[PDB]
Design a protein around this ligand. Structure first.
Ligand SMILES: CC1=C(/C=C/C(C)=C/C=C/C(C)=C\CO)C(C)(C)CCC1
Ligand code: NA
Length: 134
């Protein structure tokens, strides 16, 4: 597949508020959150990946093996736990987060020199796009 490794700076963040509200994030935390511009710092070696979502407020760190279900601790976001699997779908990464909220997960892929992220929960869609600083 491809190598997602890089420091990717946020360019686009669409519908983040609705996504966070669907996760029952409280108004105060939602308020500070949509002023953040979280970046993605990714390091990958084959199926082993660390995805760090970095913001000035709080970070969220994912560390996993593609194909292997793990207990995902979403402290800092909605403080839930999911039974999560990230899978290859050709050159895209497809993540299913099993738990309280239905249809929760995301897709990550590269189009040209842009990193694209679609986050989903309960039919709510948030679009994020990032680029490395050339
Ligand atoms: C609300 C909220 C945040 C949400 C982060 C999210 C929703 C990250 C999603 C990452 C995905 C979907 C894939 C790569 O791991 C962070 C923790 C930045 C700051 C505190 C407020
Ligand atoms: Na930020």
């Amino acid at each position: 597949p491809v190598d997602f490794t890089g420091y990717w700076k946020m360019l686009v963040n669409e519908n983040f508020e609705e996504y966070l509200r669907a996760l029952d994030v409280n108004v105060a935390l939602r308020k500070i959150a949509n002023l953040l511009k979280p970046d993605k710092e990714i390091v990958q070696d084959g199926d082993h990946m660390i995805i760090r979502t970095l913001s000035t407020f709080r970070n969220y760190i994912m560390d996993f093996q593609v194909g292997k279900e793990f207990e995902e601790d979403l402290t800092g976001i909605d403080d839930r736990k999911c039974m999560t699997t990230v899978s290859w779908d050709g050159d895209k990464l497809q993540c299913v987060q099993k738990g309280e909220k239905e249809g929760r997960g995301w897709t990550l892929w590269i189009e040209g020199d842009e990193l694209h992220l679609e986050m989903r929960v309960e039919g709510v869609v948030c679009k994020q796009v990032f680029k490395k600083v050339q």
